[PDB]
Amino acid sequence: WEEEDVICDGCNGPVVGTRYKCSVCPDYDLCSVCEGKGLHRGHTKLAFP
Ligand SMILES: [Zn+2]
Ligand SMILES: [Zn+2]
Structure with a gap:
């Protein structure tokens, strides 16, 4: 029961x-x-659920 949160x-x-x-x-x-607040805006991100 190892879980990644x-x-x-x-x-x-x-x-x-x-x-x-x-x-x-x-x-x-x-x-x-x-994300909406513009944090970490200098790096490309992957938007998955
Ligand atoms: Zn947050
Ligand atoms: Zn980054």
């Missing part, structure tokens, strides 16, 4: 719904809100 690197809450993971940074993720 995804925490937003902005609000530090878990990412539920759309996940914006950085394509450059290893293991960097933002939630839909923090």
Whole structure:
């Protein structure tokens, strides 16, 4: 029962719904809100659920 949860690197809450993971940074993720706020805007991101 090893589980991987995804925490937003902005609000530090878990990412539920759309996940914006950085394509450059290893293991960097933002939630839909923090993405909307323009965080980490210098790196390309992958927007999957
Ligand atoms: Zn967030
Ligand atoms: Zn980045």
